[PDB]
Design a protein around this ligand. Structure first.
Ligand code: SF4
Ligand code: SF4
Ligand code: SF4
Ligand code: FES
Ligand code: FES
Lengths: 164, 239, 59, 688, 241
């Protein structure tokens, strides 16, 4: 039996990505940036390929690499450039064109897909593998019954009993 | 939780603060150390509920912050665990009460028998409601759940704190009318000892009943175990 | 819905399904059945009436 | 093994799980994320919120999946009508007494209760009765309580008992009137007391310095490292424009699990005060603002007019590896050799990396059954590391200490307090040696206060003899560990940032420098910065080192740059810029490259990648970020090599092995400027 | 505060050691059973319902009593003999709780004929429990009695788990409104739904014991609750107009 998110339109998205002839499209390095038509100094900047960790404030795991095959979780991020305050109002000003484009719009299923996008666009990239969660609990409090075990204070000595 | 204790946190009082002192006497310390020996040494914390009860008679019917801290030091446990136990259980008073603690049952088997009229009689006589102490410091009125005396409903329990640990008395008074509880309160106030148990029979044996919460109405009928008691007997355990 | 507030009996948003059909290769399209259910005379022509309202689900 | 992985069925899918796993862990291994409020991975199981209720075949009741163990061949269903009805009913019970507080609550936007109500709950309520109202509690300056929002999950109580070790919270009352806190007015005194704000799933416990300032959706999060100590805890920095709003931990099981100390969490408000944003040159009027060309020219003129033997360079506690190698190469290019470190023991030999790093690593220390601490206070040096030591204590690892007796929140055996006790332990006079000799995997942890001593070589020789006799280092296990308390020390030891033999001799006969370069140093000794010298200060806060300088060159803080730092286990980690540079400040290695150009001898690197490649050319393990090598162990050949340092400066068997950290809340220039740390100290002073 | 099962007290109990908890009356009858034989004990009562039992009869009864009797005795026999019958005659009976407070009540039609037995009260949608018999007559406000029972279960909740701790107070508030008739007719079905939400969803069996009396009250006296709601508007809708 096979049932891996088999009740939604994502079935019709996984295929249409493996249609023959279109599943083997490939370009040389930096070639997609030449035909993109954006200024060429944009590709002198550095990019980071990484999957963001779970927020500490909440316990849910949906925006992590646990659901990597279900949901795109890998991101492309750029270093910050200068910001200052507006003299009249105090609003935060910037001259960065890539200020929100990687964090809002570019999401990928795997690390290699984001690498392929960076390679064909000409961005130099560094890849950061996320830290793997550990599921095995401690030896103490491994199960619920270890809360009430004999490991709290040892086996009780029967020396204060009447008739000792 | 009980009556008279609306806070589950400590409130500073000139009578009740961290500067207040508590210490056991010699005989009470003997009692507490005898209680501790009932349990294993590495599980000495099992003794907290009887020790806190004994401390409650020692301190005069209620637990102060100093008494709880002394008990915490005595059993070698953190004070927050002692505060947890003392706030969890209904008998533990954490504010100062009177000399006699009058507790009336209000659960439905006592309620059908007219516990509300007994409460009305107590409030009309003593002049206080539930959760209050008299201006003389004699009586404190409280409400309780089912006390396991339902065949002799309606009933009142009265706790004696005028003699300390050695003369502590927790006495049930059962099968009551307004006249019976008024007489019991007057007998306690005058310095006598009212009779314990039911006011119209000995025990839970078949006899009459309180009709409407105002009048005992005796009724005759079949009674069991009226003859001679059974002799010792055993079958042949071999075969 | 004032006192009957349960939601999973009316969760239409999350209860739709997409199912991958078996691979449409060796099926039997009979055109004879398709053209055998069609009329040939003016009477016996049946028309689908226009829907009066879109579904309101009782509200 | 007798089938150590058992097979269960979750929604008719076969799942293999380890033995002893619960139903919730089997659901997690099947790719299903079960709603929960009281379960936590790091705490003990409670089972009181009733949100994790699933259906198991041949059971007529819903089971609590967090607590129920998974049996062989078990069939779990997570999407039947009774599971959905159970989830909606439990949510409805959770919401009847909750206050309508989402506009004023700080969890709004990142709330487990809100999101779980949106997904697994209903859209209506039928409750029109009056709610329960609770007064709020005072727990100190870091934890803010609005206790009407409590849902009685008891995560805080389990945390305070199990991880922090203080055990000061409890549940008082009964029933609907159950109430979380301390019965008397008390202050939460743990160093790890900000983690309980993360552990609370609701806005009952929020962060008091952060209160009412931001919503979570506005914050740009950057994954960085923590530099307030030597462990290098992994963090996330949340910023709104140019301003850092909060700092949170992030998961790393090899470093910090999920925790972060209160200093590393709350010292960010020191980044908004006393900041150097402009270059300054001291004139006849005093220090006044100057251009970068003028400031670089003045620093170059003072660095070139002096003789090479009158120049000293001191690295601070927070200098990254790139700026340190830049300063080292610039001073060595001028013919100088006087290099010093603000973290002490600058003359310590750094030949083998195993002699000043933790060979067992942080996660590998959990396989030790007996731990001997030598002269360290891990609760104040690294509270997250001390929390992992308490975790080791709770499942059977015994701890002994040779040093000054300290509160560690776990029981230990005090072997002694001086190097005389260490020698008695090595000879056999104390019975703890027989406990070490019979242990399967013994471990020794040496703190940085031992290395700061003038007789550290004799003490390290005694420690090496003890490790040789007790089987601490053998085939298959290396239990010798040296920890640190400063972020920049191990990288300086890795690259060779140390004084030459001629400079050590000149300090021995008492030569005094005339030009001092202070690379972020504000806790220098008075022996190293003479009065009347020329001082070049490069840093980000105006402090003791900037008030004394003639040239001030403004650099970046660790929230504004991406520099390399190595923790005490040898792992290379990096910061990342969460905000841009402030004012007219620059990158810290770039200032030294520009200054090397103005002096007249350029550094051979012009980019961040090139200076990192220079670092990798010195020591190749610098290139492998987020990883740790296995260091070479040379047995007693190294100790035989430095016996001249043992013969000179002999042992002091009466001076106690203590810890040098006397102020935990204020250790560097950032934490000294933090008003929250000052309130933290004032709260411990006003309780007496 | 109760622990979750598993583990079980015979596996991990007091101080982490194997432990069995048994009732006083269960313990006390064992020496007589061992001396007089198991065949003597099983000769009383129906199959799978063997032996004798202490019964406590309280409430509107002429002679309230703690009396020992054979099991599988009828309620009417157990009350008319040994207790003097219902106050005002058997035709003045309104309802009877047969097993303490945690079991649902029974009306007069079920009570006339049912045996006081484990496998006989259960089929009558009740239970034997502790065999404590509480008798109400036709002067009783049965909604008020079950409301005081709801107050008891609110007062005695330990507060550990969400459904018991939050919903016993909710049940008490709804019952207090129902006693005065200040409610809606569909709030009765809401009340049944809330009891079904508590029951079977908690750590221990006090949540079930809190749901069960309200279920019995609704099932056997829904007409009384509806009449209490309808007739309250004879004193509340005269002010609205
Ligand atoms: S905890 Fe705060 S944000 Fe979450 S539901 Fe309650 S009031 Fe709203
Ligand atoms: S304060 Fe937070 S963590 Fe503590 S019991 Fe309440 S909801 Fe749970
Ligand atoms: S059902 Fe009630 S008494 Fe039992 S554990 Fe839950 S809250 Fe406590
Ligand atoms: S109801 Fe009053 S003693 Fe039980
Ligand atoms: S997560 Fe299992 S009951 Fe709370």
């Amino acid at each position: 039996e096979f049932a891996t998110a088999s009740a939604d339109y994502s079935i019709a998205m996984k295929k249409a990505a493996e249609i023959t002839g279109a599943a083997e499209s490939a370009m040389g390095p930096k070639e997609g940036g030449f035909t993109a038509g954006v200024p060429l100094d944009t590709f002198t900047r550095k990019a980071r390929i990484y999957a963001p960790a779970r927020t500490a404030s909440q316990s849910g795991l949906a925006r992590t690499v646990d659901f990597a095959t279900t949901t795109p979780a890998w991101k492309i991020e750029f270093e910050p450039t200068a910001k200052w305050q507006n003299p009249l109002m105090g609003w935060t000003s910037s001259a960065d064109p890539l200020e929100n484009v990687g964090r809002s719009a570019l999401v990928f299923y795997t690390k290699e897909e984001a690498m392929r996008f960076c390679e064909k666009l000409g961005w130099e990239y560094e890849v950061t593998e996320p830290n793997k969660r550990r599921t095995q609990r401690t030896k103490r409090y491994m199960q619920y019954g270890d809360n009430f075990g004999t490991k709290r204070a040892g086996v009780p000595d029967l020396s204060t009993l009447p008739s000792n | 939780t009980n009556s008279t204790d609306i806070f589950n946190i400590h409130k500073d009082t000139p009578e009740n603060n961290a500067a207040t002192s508590f210490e056991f006497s010699e005989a009470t310390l003997k009692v507490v150390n005898d209680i501790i020996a009932r349990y294993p040494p590495n599980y000495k914390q099992s003794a907290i509920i009887p020790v806190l009860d004994v401390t409650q008679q020692e301190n005069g019917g209620w637990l102060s912050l100093a008494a709880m801290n002394r008990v915490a030091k005595l059993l070698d446990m953190a004070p927050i665990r002692v505060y947890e136990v003392a706030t969890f259980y209904t008998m533990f008073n954490r504010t100062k009460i009177g000399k006699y603690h009058v507790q009336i049952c209000g659960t439905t088997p006592c309620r059908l028998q007219g516990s509300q009229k007994i409460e009305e009689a107590i409030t009309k006589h003593l002049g206080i409601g539930i959760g209050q102490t008299t201006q003389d410091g004699l009586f404190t009125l409280g409400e309780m759940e089912c006390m396991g005396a339902c065949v002799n409903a309606p009933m009142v329990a009265i706790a004696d704190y005028t003699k300390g640990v050695s003369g502590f008395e927790y006495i049930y008074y059962e099968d009551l009318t307004p006249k019976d509880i008024v007489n019991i309160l007057d007998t306690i106030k005058k310095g006598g000892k009212p009779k314990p148990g039911s006011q119209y029979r000995l025990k839970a044996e078949p006899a009459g009943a309180v009709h409407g919460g105002e009048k005992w109405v005796p009724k005759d009928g079949e009674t069991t175990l009226t003859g001679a008691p059974r002799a010792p007997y055993c079958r042949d355990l071999n075969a | 819905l004032v006192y009957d507030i349960k939601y999973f009996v009316r969760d239409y948003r999350r209860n739709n399904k997409y199912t991958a059909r078996t691979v449409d290769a060796k099926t039997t399209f009979d055109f004879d059945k398709l053209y055998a259910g069609m009329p040939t005379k003016p009477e016996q022509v049946k028309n689908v009436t226009r829907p009066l309202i879109m579904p309101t689900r009782g509200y | 093994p007798p089938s150590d992985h058992l097979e269960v069925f979750v929604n008719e899918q076969p799942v293999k799980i380890p033995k002893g796993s619960s139903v919730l862990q089997a659901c997690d291994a099947a790719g299903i994320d079960i709603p929960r409020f009281c379960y936590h991975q790091r705490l003990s199981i409670a089972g009181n919120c009733r949100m994790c209720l699933v259906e198991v075949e041949k059971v007529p009741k819903p089971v609590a999946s967090c607590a129920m163990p998974a049996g062989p061949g078990m069939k779990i269903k997570t999407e039947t009508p009774m599971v959905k009805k159970a989830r909606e009913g439990v949510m409805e019970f959770l919401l009847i007494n909750h206050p309508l507080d989402c506009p004023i609550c700080d969890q709004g936007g990142e709330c487990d209760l809100q999101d779980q109500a949106m997904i697994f709950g209903s859209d209506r309520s039928r409750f029109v009765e009056a709610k329960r109202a609770v007064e709020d509690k005072n727990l100190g300056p870091l934890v803010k309580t609005v206790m009407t929002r409590c849902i009685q999950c008891t995560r805080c109580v389990r945390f305070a008992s199990e991880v922090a070790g203080t055990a000061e919270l409890g549940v008082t009352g009964r029933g609907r009137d159950s109430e979380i806190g301390t019965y008397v007015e008390k202050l939460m005194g743990s160093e790890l007391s900000g983690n309980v704000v993360d552990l609370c799933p609701v806005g009952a416990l929020t962060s008091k310095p952060y209160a009412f300032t931001a919503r979570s959706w506005e914050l740009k999060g950057t994954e960085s490292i923590d530099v307030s100590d030597g462990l290098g805890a992994n963090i996330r920095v949340d910023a709104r424009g140019t301003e850092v709003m909060r700092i949170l931990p992030r998961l790393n099981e090899a470093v910090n699990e999920e925790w972060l100390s209160d200093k590393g969490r709350y010292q960010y408000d020191g980044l908004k005060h006393q900041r150097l944003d402009k270059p300054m040159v001291k004139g006849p009027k005093g220090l006044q603002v100057a251009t970068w060309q003028d400031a670089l020219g003045a620093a170059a003129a003072a660095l070139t007019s002096a003789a090479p033997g009158e120049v000293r360079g001191i690295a601070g506690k927070l200098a990254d590896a790139e700026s340190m190698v830049a300063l080292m190469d610039l001073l060595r290019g001028l013919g100088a050799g006087d290099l010093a470190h603000e973290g002490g023991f600058s003359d310590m030999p750094a030949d083998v990396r195993s002699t000043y790093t933790a060979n067992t690593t942080v996660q590998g220390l959990e396989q030790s059954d007996l731990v001997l601490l030598v002269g360290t206070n891990p609760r104040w040096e690294s509270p997250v590391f001390n929390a992992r030591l308490r975790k080791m204590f709770l499942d059977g690892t015994q701890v002994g200490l040779v040093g000054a007796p300290v509160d560690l929140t776990y029981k230990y055996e005090h072997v002694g307090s001086d190097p005389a006790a260490l020698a008695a332990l090595a000879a056999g006079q104390h019975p703890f040696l027989e406990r070490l000799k019979k242990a399967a995997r013994p471990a020794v942890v040496v703190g940085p206060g031992v290395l700061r001593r003038a007789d550290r070589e004799a003490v390290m020789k005694a420690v090496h003899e003890l490790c040789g006799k007790a089987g601490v280092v053998k085939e298959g296990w290396n239990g010798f560990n040296v920890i640190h308390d400063t972020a920049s020390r191990v990288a300086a030891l890795d690259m060779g940032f140390g004084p030459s033999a001629a400079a050590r001799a000149r300090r021995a006969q008492g030569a005094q420098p005339k030009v001092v370069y202070l690379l972020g140093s504000d806790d220098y000794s008075e022996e190293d910065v003479p009065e009347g010298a020329f001082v070049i200060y490069q840093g980000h806060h105006g402090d003791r080192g900037a008030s004394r300088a003639n040239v001030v060159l403004p650099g970046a803080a660790y929230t504004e740059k991406s520099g390399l730092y190595v923790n005490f286990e040898g792992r290379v980690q990096q910061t990342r810029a969460a905000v841009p540079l402030v004012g007219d400040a620059r990158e810290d290695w770039a200032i030294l490259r520009a200054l090397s150009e103005v002096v007249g001898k350029r550094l051979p690197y012009d980019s961040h990648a090139a200076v990192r490649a220079r670092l990798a050319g010195i020591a190749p393990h610098f290139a492998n970020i987020d990883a740790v090598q296995t260091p070479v162990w040379l047995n007693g050949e190294y100790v035989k090599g430095v016996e001249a340092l043992a013969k000179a400066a002999p042992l002091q068997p009466s001076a106690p092995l203590t810890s040098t950290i006397s102020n935990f809340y204020m250790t560097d220039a950032i934490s000294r400027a933090s008003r929250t740390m000052a309130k933290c100290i004032q709260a411990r002073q006003q309780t007496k | 505060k109760p622990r979750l099962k598993p583990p079980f007290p015979a596996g991990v109990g007091l101080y982490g050691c194997p432990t069995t908890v048994t009732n006083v009356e269960t313990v006390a009858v064992s020496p007589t059973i061992l001396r007089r034989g198991p065949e003597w004990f099983s000769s009383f009562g129906r199959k799978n319902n063997a032996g004798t039992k202490l019964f406590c009869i309280s409430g509107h009864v002429n002679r309230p009593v703690t009396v020992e009797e054979e099991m599988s005795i009828p309620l009417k026999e157990l009350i008319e003999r040994h207790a003097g019958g219902v106050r005002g005659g058997w035709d003045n009976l309104l309802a009877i709780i047969p097993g303490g407070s945690s079991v649902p009540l029974l009306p007069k039609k079920i009570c006339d004929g049912v045996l006081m037995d484990f496998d006989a009260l259960k089929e009558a949608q009740s239970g034997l429990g502790t065999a404590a018999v509480i008798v109400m007559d036709k002067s009783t406000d049965v909604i008020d009695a079950i409301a005081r029972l709801s107050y008891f279960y609110k007062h005695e909740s330990c507060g550990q788990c969400t459904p018991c701790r939050e919903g016993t107070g909710w049940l008490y508030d709804i019952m207090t409104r129902m006693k005065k008739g200040d409610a809606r007719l569909e709030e009765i079905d809401m009340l049944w739904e809330i009891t079904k939400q508590i029951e079977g969803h908690t750590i221990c069996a006090l949540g079930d014991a809190a749901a069960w009396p309200v279920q019995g009250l609704i099932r056997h006296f829904r007409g009384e609750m509806e009449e209490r709601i309808k007739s309250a508007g004879g004193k509340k809708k005269l002010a609205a107009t």
